[PDB]
Design a protein around this ligand. Structure first.
Ligand code: SF4
Ligand code: SF4
Ligand code: SF4
Ligand code: SF4
Ligand code: SF4
Ligand code: SF4
Ligand code: SF4
Ligand code: FES
Ligand SMILES: [Ca+2]
Lengths: 169, 905, 147, 571, 145
């Protein structure tokens, strides 16, 4: 797969960053209350809620306080795009101002969708190349262009024929 | 008159019926078979109200409000329970046989039947039996036929036959198997058949051109615009979706084109959606074609234009007033040339002089319907100015209107009017080189060469007023028919003289001016109408400039080494060999245009101008009315690399880069101020529409309806990030629904008609002061000039009779509503409707040549031999040959020219 | 086009006003006798078929409401009537009266129906045998069970 | 004479009293469908009318609502004074069990009203929001600053000429706002927040962080001497969105206000729309709506009681709600004239399993909360107010009933057939502290379980949608089979249902107090005005008047004891 | 364990097919206008027999709130919300689902409804008069009165 801007131990580093992820769940709105450490210690920011203009600086500041390597998971339609609130007081998406690694649709998403997003982030972390040290080697981060989850899951989704009727519980 | 509706007192017009009087008051009565332009017939039985004898009456009686006069002291109830139950029952009876078709029906969301079903509150079906079904017909490329959806309201036949004068649509059958259509499959033959898609309250007659690329009404982006396909200036609402122009709706203008368009304006819009249009500036370097953005195109053009000694500019009657003015400012006043030929310019300037100096009032298109006798000289109105022909048909039916009014029959009781006035009609005298479509209602048709038509006009003017120059050599039978014309015109209270520049004869315009002056001197309330060729022919005539021949002379002599051609193909106004030679000699050609023309192969730079859909501007009517057209959509919203600016914007920024080496993308109001400051006879165009700072209680005017969908998905395949809403700095309209389109808003520019409960074209009732009247706060548009205090003198240049000289063939112009206009004949749906190119011959001339009907003859014009199949024309005269103007290879400038070497190929 | 009359109305003089006061009209004064072997539902069905197919198609109540009454009468003649059919016939009679339609064809059409429902209602009610249904079951959608 | 009929309420005794006091030409009575007498008052008599209503024999004691309205585009103003803007004041007399609405008309060039804060202290935040969203100045207001938008905001969003949709994002303004938040504590002027005596060398300023909101604290040592909370960080523009969606398509937005509520939030909106539409829903619709609202009320009460001190009960409730509606948190299931679908076959078993499992949990929660002595020492007596403070601050729900005032909307002003259910309204003593509120929430949980038991025992058979033509959408099987039903469905889901021009009002007992929708239709398919009164706004405004002289930990306990979420505050 | 979802669950949106195997969507655009967020876009196209179908059909799932108003507004039961929630993505552009990402190979939750069997518009396999509760077309030239 393509990558966008001595080998076994790099894989071990990716494995350690993959299996050790300390999240910082930002509350924001109802997505966090569906889902229900300091930003210095956290390496994952889970933004789940409406990005209001009055606390977009709060999100930006708490993201800047985090330390590399850092990853962002955006839960719900508000954090992905603004959702149903295309309105004067709402920022239309988290990725307007901070980069997002995984997106989850929903309003709110289920908690096991958050677990699925954690699995996807673990794969993305395990298949990436980052500098080993700040004095030796290339100081560039190579994100891998993963195959999209809708192209990967297309066959089993299109193969669906019948569903249970909505007259039952 | 005073009426009492539900205990509330209203003051109405007593000459109205109750339906139109109550709809004018804002009351909602359901109706199908009534139309404001068609009258009342009482078919659908939907408009029932309860009329009481007096104030102290409670029983009452159900009456049809469309058939009941709004007399003084009337007492009615709309919300009476019996009336509401009966109206719901009528809707239910219509619903019994209606197909389950709304998702796959083009009328959905725009359907009067849907609106009236919801308005009566009928939503529960208890009919359990079968539905009658019908076969459909093929009605041609424009109208799609779906007979299942018919509610038998008879609006189509009343419009098409009684109003429009068509003959091939009718009602067939009986009890509940009534069928509305043609006697057999075939194209509907009326030039105004396209108004059936708004006349029909259901989805029987639908816009087939729109149906190919269908979208719902709530998804359209609309703008108020002016039709660009002839000089009548009918108000239109073009609506677009996904970056392409989807539909042309009628925009109600009570002064011009009230409810109706012609088929050219309604269906010839398809050239806007052509894929060969220039979408980005292109500079030819060697054999390569480098694509530029706006900035470096302006810089390179300014550098090359600064290095040249003299720059000339060639305008067009297609372009707006602002575009031609911007070209005139860029090249200078003395270097600006109107893009039309010398004879065309002479006829156009004479028509302008007659209109604004002849002392005779020129009527608006709606006012044409109130004249008592019509003389049409040389102008094939139905093929060149079609809506004038429709208005002339109404003016002719005015005699039956007067006869019925003499028997105290109400104005709206149309069936009684047509029964009283059986075949009596106001006099119509048409003159042409052959038969016209107005001959069915014409009192007399004169088929003659344009010299003889002019001589007939001069003879009529002399017989009305002996001070006019006389005509020598009139035959006694022609003299008797002239006397019939003179008796009909002299007895008319409001005679109307219609002529125009399409005959290719200056003398026809002079004769029409003489007839109008002679009738003015007798005290008649005479009006005169001039039909020009193009959308802004009158504006280009007012602005003035040299002819195209002078510009080609400047290019060929080498006095001009740079030419800027604005929206002109130059082959319709001059010979193509001369134009190609002059443009090949010039070391710099810059073509500012929105259509891929044949002169762009010689062009060093092509500026991708916008069409009427993507531009704002002002165009001048054939009656001298300045009208704004507003931009429908931003072309760069979907394709980000599209650089398609207004022509005045291109030329103003080019002038600014020529002077101060900085681009200046100006504003429309600035250019309009420049026009009204420099050209004082175009000063009326400032008042055509309010400027860009106009607001309705602080908000702009919406281009799209409130329920516009796909706001976060229509561009999502390009990018999931929703782009910036395009900002309109030129006009008061916004490229969003965040704006006002209220029916009670104090404005005259209405992009589209929608009211809650009224989704169909019947929503225009809410936007009018009275139904069928004007718009509530005035119709848009302003007359540039008033009637002159003193008129002209008589034109003494009476031409001689036509003489067929051997070897020469006078070209008689034949115009086609589908084909003669340039941009509309570029539209793909016109190609099926376009007649095959036939060269028309007299039987005697074809017998002299030995030529039969259908064999191909070759003729040479300007040293160019072209071949056409022969059609025999009995109405044509000997020594004349008939040619279809504006088709492929036959320029309209050929009208009146002679022909050489006509022989069988 | 005239209303049916019973044995009690046989003693009335054949005048315009005397028969007008009885709930009918004199008409052409050519009377037709209906014996006990003729079913009134079939007779009115034949009458309404004539009146429905002799409509001119101009106006909505006759053109679209006479065929509905015809189909209801065919159902009642076959015994396939459903509840609300007699009420539908009565409101068709009430809404096809004078002034509701464009001409007098439809009031004359609904006069026999009105008179036969008024007098011989037992046959029209005997035509109704099936429960009312114009909607079938759609598999995944629970119906709105009105009362 | 249906419950949705347009009435003028001229037979209300308050109209006669105002007529005898001020004269017959001093006010204009408007006939509405609000169920409330609406009188237009001159601006120069507003304080006189308010003080007269404060002093009646059964006086109007609570300012329920105060907001503005842009009347410029309203084309149906028959029988109304000439107004470009207007301000309305909804006042409630609990003793009279009545309410009145006062409307003051304002011309566009003179947009100032006398302040109402001397008569009713909750008018402070209500007038601040009216200034923020409409630009209407209130003369005599102490700190008339913006409360929803930031202070450096241009324009007033609820005006008709303000664009609703989101503007283009600017990274420069984001960096500027982050810079301002960086130096906010450095340049904290204690006058742009209404404070005074800013820095006796002992007053310290603190900024802090059920939703996220910042409260500015003035401390003398450890004591709180003054505090102003900064709200608006969760402002979604739900009312502006009300003017941009159709009547049908706005229902999910009703859901997202008070996200613990769900169908409880849907209920007052659809009831007010049905008042506008002239719809009387059948009994099965009433029982379905009551049952879902009580399930969500139990869920919210369980979350409040647990977070005051848990998961399995809420999981069972969300499983039942997901079975019925298809979604846990935001069902969007109520409709104009009914509900989206019928009850699924098998809902009886799920509700019976939930009801046969809940009383043991009720006993567990009573043991965990009422008999906990450490909780009874921690929560008793901290931030307690009486009936007088509850009335003057618009406190509703558990706090108002904990002050001993027996005012529940389900019994005082019954809606959706709540009068057909046998249940009790628990009231407390004269003191509304944390422990009394928790006791009342537990007793309300028990009564909601009783209501659910009655919903299960006799569930009416019938339609889940009304027979009205304005029922949106129509029943789906008739839509798929019948053409007139298809036409109605087509126009209702696309252009929208046409509500005839009127004003309606519905107030309900939400999970945290009284929630109300005030809807103005101008005859169109969208709302001309959607005003949402939420209890959390009035409960947050009462906080500075109840912790004067307390500690910061007492403030934290008070925040935990007041049932509120910030989406309800800011909407 | 696998997560249980009720049959009414409002998860991933699909487009379904009629029992004859053709796609149910007639591109009537009712779902797009009924969407409160505006995240459905489609274009009507027509086959040679006259059958309406979506030329394209895209849903912005980064914008969708899974409220089910599109399914409620569909008059053909083409668009359906299904019990499936696993829809996470790496790029937000990959949350734009086109028609080949939505069109399943069966009827979904409504196994038998066919809109075209009810519509009076003629298509292939269904002439005039062949829809439900439809009589055969009587020609205007027929001999019967
Ligand atoms: S996506 Fe939905 S549930 Fe999540 S924060 Fe937004 S409105 Fe709340
Ligand atoms: S004509 Fe109107 S009512 Fe009939 S199918 Fe078309 S949209 Fe529906
Ligand atoms: S085809 Fe249309 S206009 Fe003609 S009668 Fe039928 S519904 Fe009326
Ligand atoms: S008459 Fe002329 S201006 Fe009017 S619609 Fe036809 S082409 Fe256009
Ligand atoms: S009542 Fe008369 S006008 Fe009307 S359709 Fe019948 S026969 Fe024709
Ligand atoms: S579920 Fe709701 S938000 Fe999603 S596409 Fe359908 S209508 Fe739009
Ligand atoms: S509502 Fe249904 S049939 Fe109509 S466009 Fe949407 S998915 Fe297709
Ligand atoms: S509109 Fe009056 S009967 Fe048709
Ligand atoms: Ca522009």
């Amino acid at each position: 797969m393509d990558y966008t801007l001595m080998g076994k131990l790099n894989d071990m580093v990716n494995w350690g960053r993959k299996n050790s992820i300390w999240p910082y769940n930002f509350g924001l709105s109802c997505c966090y209350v569906e889902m229900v450490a300091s930003p210095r210690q956290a390496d994952l920011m889970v933004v789940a809620g409406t990005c209001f203009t009055k606390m977009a600086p709060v999100i930006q500041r708490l993201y800047d306080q985090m330390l590399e390597p850092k990853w962002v998971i955006s839960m719900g339609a508000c954090a992905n795009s603004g959702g149903m609130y295309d309105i004067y007081s709402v920022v239309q998406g988290v990725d307007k101002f901070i980069p997002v690694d995984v997106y989850i649709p929903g309003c709110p998403p289920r908690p096991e969708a958050y677990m699925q997003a954690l699995m996807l982030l673990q794969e993305s972390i395990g298949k990436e190349r980052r500098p080993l040290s700040w004095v030796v080697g290339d100081q560039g981060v190579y994100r891998a262009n993963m195959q999209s989850e809708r192209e990967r899951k297309r066959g089993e989704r299109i193969a669906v024929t019948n569903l249970r009727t909505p007259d039952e519980i | 008159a005073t009426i009492h509706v539900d205990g509330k007192e209203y003051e109405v017009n007593g000459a109205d019926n109750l339906l139109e009087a109550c709809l004018s008051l804002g009351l909602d009565i359901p109706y199908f078979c009534w139309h404001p332009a068609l009258g009342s017939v009482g078919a659908c039985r939907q408009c029932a109200v309860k009329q009481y004898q007096n104030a102290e009456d409670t029983r009452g009686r159900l009456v049809m409000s469309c058939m009941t006069p709004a007399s003084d002291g009337t007492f009615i109830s709309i919300d009476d329970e019996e009336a509401k139950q009966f109206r719901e029952s009528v809707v239910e009876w219509l619903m019994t046989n209606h197909p389950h078709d709304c998702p796959v029906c083009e009328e959905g969301g725009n359907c009067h039947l849907q609106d009236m079903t919801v308005m009566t509150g009928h939503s529960f079906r208890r009919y359990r039996f079968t539905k009658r079904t019908h076969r459909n017909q093929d009605l041609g490329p424009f109208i799609s036929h779906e007979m299942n959806r018919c509610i038998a309201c008879y609006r189509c036949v009343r419009y098409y036959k009684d109003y429009a004068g068509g003959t091939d649509l009718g009602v067939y059958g009986a009890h509940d198997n009534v069928y509305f259509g043609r006697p057999e499959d075939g194209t509907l033959e009326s030039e105004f058949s396209g108004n059936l898609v708004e006349i029909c309250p259901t989805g029987v007659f639908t816009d087939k051109t729109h149906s190919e690329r269908y979208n719902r009404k709530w998804d359209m982006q609309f703008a108020p615009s002016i039709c660009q396909q002839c000089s009548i200036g009918c108000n239109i609402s073009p609506g677009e979706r996904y970056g392409e122009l989807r539909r042309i709706e009628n925009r109600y203008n009570g002064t011009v084109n009230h409810y109706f368009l012609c088929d050219r304006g309604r269906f010839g819009y398809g050239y806007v959606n052509l894929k060969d249009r220039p979408r980005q500036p292109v500079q030819r370097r060697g054999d390569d074609f480098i694509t530029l953005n706006a900035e470096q195109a302006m810089q390179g053009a300014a550098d090359i234009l600064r290095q040249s000694k003299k720059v000339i500019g060639i305008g067009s009657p297609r372009a707006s007033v602002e575009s031609n003015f911007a070209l005139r400012e860029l090249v200078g006043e003395e270097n600006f040339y109107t893009g039309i030929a010398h004879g065309e310019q002479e006829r156009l300037q004479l028509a302008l002089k007659v209109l604004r100096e002849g002392g005779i009032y020129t009527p608006a298109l709606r006012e044409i319907e109130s004249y008592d006798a019509v003389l049409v000289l040389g102008e094939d109105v139905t093929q060149t100015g079609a809506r004038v022909a429709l208005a002339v048909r109404q003016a002719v039916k005015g005699k039956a209107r007067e006869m019925a009014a003499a028997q105290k029959v109400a104005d709206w009781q149309i069936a009684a009017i047509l029964n009283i006035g059986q075949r009596a009609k106001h006099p119509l005298f048409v003159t042409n080189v052959d038969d016209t479509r107005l001959d069915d209602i014409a009192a007399w048709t004169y088929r003659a060469p344009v010299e003889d038509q002019a001589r007939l006009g001069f003879a009529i003017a002399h017989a009305l007023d002996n001070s006019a120059p006389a005509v020598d050599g009139i035959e006694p039978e022609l003299q008797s028919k002239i006397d019939v014309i003179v008796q009909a015109l002299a007895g008319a209270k409001k005679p109307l003289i219609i002529s125009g520049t399409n005959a290719g004869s200056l003398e026809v315009i002079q004769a029409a001016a003489n007839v109008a002056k002679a009738l003015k001197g007798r005290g008649a309330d005479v009006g005169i109408t001039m039909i020009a060729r193009s959308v802004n022919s009158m504006g280009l005539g007012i602005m003035g400039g040299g002819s195209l021949e002078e510009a080609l002379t400047e290019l060929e002599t080498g006095r001009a080494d740079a030419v800027v051609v604005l929206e002109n193909d130059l082959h319709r106004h001059a010979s193509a060999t001369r134009v190609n030679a002059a443009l090949a000699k010039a070391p710099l050609v810059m073509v500012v245009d929105h259509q891929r023309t044949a002169i762009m192969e010689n062009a060093h730079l092509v500026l991708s101008a916008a069409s009427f859909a993507e531009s704002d501007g002002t165009v001048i009517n054939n009656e001298g009315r300045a009208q704004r057209f507003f931009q429908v959509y931003d072309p760069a919203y979907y394709d980000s690399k599209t650089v398609m600016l207004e022509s005045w914007r291109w030329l103003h920024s080019l002038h600014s880069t020529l002077l101060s080496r900085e681009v200046d993308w100006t504003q429309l109001d600035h250019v309009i101020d420049a026009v009204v400051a420099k050209i004082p006879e175009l000063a009326g165009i400032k008042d055509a529409a309010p400027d860009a700072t106009f607001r309705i209680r602080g908000q702009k005017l919406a281009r799209e309806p409130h329920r516009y969908s796909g706001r976060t998905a229509m561009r999502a395949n390009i990018s999931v990030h929703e782009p910036r809403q395009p900002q309109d700095i030129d006009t008061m309209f916004t490229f969003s629904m965040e704006g006002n389109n209220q029916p009670t808003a104090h404005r005259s520019q209405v992009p589209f008609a929608w009211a809650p409960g009224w989704n169909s074209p019947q929503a225009w009732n809410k936007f009018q002061d009275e139904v069928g009247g004007k718009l509530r706060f005035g119709d848009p548009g302003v007359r540039l000039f008033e009637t002159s205090e003193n008129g002209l003198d008589y034109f003494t240049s009476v031409p001689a009779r036509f003489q067929p000289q051997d070897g020469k063939w006078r070209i008689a112009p034949y115009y086609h509503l589908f084909g003669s206009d340039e941009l509309s004949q570029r539209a793909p749906v016109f190609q099926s409707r376009m007649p095959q190119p036939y060269i028309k011959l007299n039987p005697a001339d074809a017998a002299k040549l030995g030529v039969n009907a259908g064999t191909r003859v070759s003729f040479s014009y300007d040293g160019n031999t072209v071949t056409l199949p022969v059609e025999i024309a009995e109405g044509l005269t000997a020594g004349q040959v008939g040619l279809p103007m504006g088709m492929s290879g036959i320029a309209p400038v050929l009208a009146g020219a002679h022909l050489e070497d006509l022989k069988e190929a | 086009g005239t209303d049916f009359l019973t044995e009690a109305h046989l003693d009335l003089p054949m005048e315009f006003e005397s028969i007008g006061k009885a709930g009918s009209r004199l008409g052409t004064a050519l009377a037709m006798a209906v014996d006990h072997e003729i079913n009134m539902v079939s007779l009115v069905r034949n009458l309404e078929e004539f009146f429905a197919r002799e409509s001119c198609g101009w106006c909505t109540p006759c053109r679209d409401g006479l065929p509905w009454s015809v189909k209801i009468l065919r159902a009642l003649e076959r015994g396939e009537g459903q509840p609300g059919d007699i009420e539908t016939l009565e409101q068709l009679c009430r809404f096809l009266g004078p002034g509701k339609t464009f001409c007098a064809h439809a009031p004359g059409a609904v006069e026999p129906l009105q008179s036969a429902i008024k007098y011989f209602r037992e046959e029209f009610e005997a035509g109704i045998k099936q429960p009312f249904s114009n909607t079938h079951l759609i598999n995944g959608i629970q119906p709105n069970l009105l009362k | 004479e249906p419950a949705w009929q347009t009435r003028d309420h001229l037979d209300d005794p308050v109209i006669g009293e105002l007529r005898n006091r001020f004269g017959p030409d001093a006010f204009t009575v408007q006939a509405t469908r609000t169920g409330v007498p609406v009188v237009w008052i001159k601006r120069e008599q507003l304080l006189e009318v308010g003080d007269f209503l404060k002093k009646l024999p059964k006086p109007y004691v609570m300012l329920f609502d105060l907001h503005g309205m842009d009347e410029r585009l309203r084309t149906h103003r028959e029988g109304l004074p000439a107004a470009d803007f207007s301000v309305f004041y909804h006042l409630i007399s609990i003793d009279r069990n009545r309410d009145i609405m006062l409307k003051v008309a304002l011309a566009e060039n003179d947009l100032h009203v006398p302040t109402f804060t001397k008569l009713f202290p909750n008018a402070n935040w209500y007038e601040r929001e009216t200034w923020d969203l409409f630009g209407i100045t209130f003369d005599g207001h102490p700190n008339l600053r913006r409360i929803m938008m930031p202070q450096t905001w241009k324009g007033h969003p609820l005006r008709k000429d303000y664009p609703a949709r989101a503007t283009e994002f600017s990274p420069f303004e984001l960096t500027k706002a982050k810079q301002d938040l960086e130096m906010e504590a450095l340049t904290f002027k204690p006058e742009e927040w209404g404070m005074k005596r800013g820095t006796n060398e002992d007053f310290m300023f603190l900024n802090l962080g059920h939703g996220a909101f910042r409260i500015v604290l003035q401390l003398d040592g450890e004591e709180i001497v003054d505090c102003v909370p900064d709200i608006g960080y969760h402002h979604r523009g739900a009312e502006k969105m009300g003017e941009r969606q159709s009547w049908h398509s706005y229902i999910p937005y009703t859901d997202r206000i008070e996200y613990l509520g769900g169908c409880v939030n849907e209920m007052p909106y659809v009831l007010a729309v049905e008042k506008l539409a002239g719809i009387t829903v059948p009994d099965r619709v009433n029982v379905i709506r009551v049952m879902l609202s009580e399930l969500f009320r139990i869920n919210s009460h369980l979350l409040y009681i647990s977070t005051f001190i848990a998961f399995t009960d809420r999981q069972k409730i969300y499983d039942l709600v997901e079975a019925i509606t298809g979604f846990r948190m935001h069902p969007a299931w109520f409709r104009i004239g009914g509900v989206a679908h019928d009850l699924p076959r098998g809902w009886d078993r799920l509700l019976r399993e939930f009801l046969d499992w809940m009383p043991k949990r009720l006993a567990s929660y009573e043991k965990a909360a009422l008999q906990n002595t450490i909780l009874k020492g921690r929560s008793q007596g901290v931030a307690a107010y009486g009936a007088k403070e509850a009335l003057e601050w618009g406190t509703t729900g558990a706090g108002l009933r904990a002050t001993g005032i027996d005012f529940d909307v389900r019994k005082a002003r019954p809606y959706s057939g709540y009068e057909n259910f046998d249940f009790e309204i628990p009231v407390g003593g004269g003191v509304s502290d944390c422990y009394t509120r928790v006791m009342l929430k537990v007793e309300e949980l028990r009564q909601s379980l009783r209501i659910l038991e009655q919903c299960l025992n006799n569930m009416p058979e019938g339609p889940f949608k009304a027979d009205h033509p304005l029922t949106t959408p129509p029943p789906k099987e008739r839509t798929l089979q019948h053409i007139e039903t298809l036409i109605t469905h087509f126009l209702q889901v696309s252009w929208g249902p046409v509500m005839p021009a009127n004003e309606s009002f519905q107030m309900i007992e939400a999970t945290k107090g009284i929630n109300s929708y005030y809807l103005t239709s101008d005859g169109s398919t969208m709302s001309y005005r959607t005003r949402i009164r939420t209890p959390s706004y009035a409960h947050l405004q009462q906080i500075p008047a109840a912790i004067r002289g307390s500690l910061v930990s007492d403030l934290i306990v008070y925040l935990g004891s007041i049932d509120f979420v910030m989406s309800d505050v800011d909407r | 364990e696998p997560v249980y979802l009720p049959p009414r669950y409002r998860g991933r949106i699909v487009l379904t097919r009629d029992p004859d195997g053709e796609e149910r969507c007639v591109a009537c655009n009712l779902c797009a206008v009924a969407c409160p967020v505006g995240c459905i876009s489609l274009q009507k196209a027509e086959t040679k027999d006259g059958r309406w179908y979506p030329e394209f059909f895209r849903i912005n799932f980064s914008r969708c709130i899974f409220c089910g108003l599109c399914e409620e507004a569909c008059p053909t039961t083409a668009i359906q919300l299904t019990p499936d929630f696993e829809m996470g993505e790496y790029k937000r552009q990959d949350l734009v689902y086109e028609k080949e990402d939505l069109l399943i190979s069966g009827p979904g939750k409504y196994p038998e409804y066919n809109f075209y069997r009810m519509a009076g518009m003629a298509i292939d396999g269904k002439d005039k008069g062949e829809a439900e509760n439809e009589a055969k077309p009587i020609d205007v030239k027929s001999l019967l009165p």
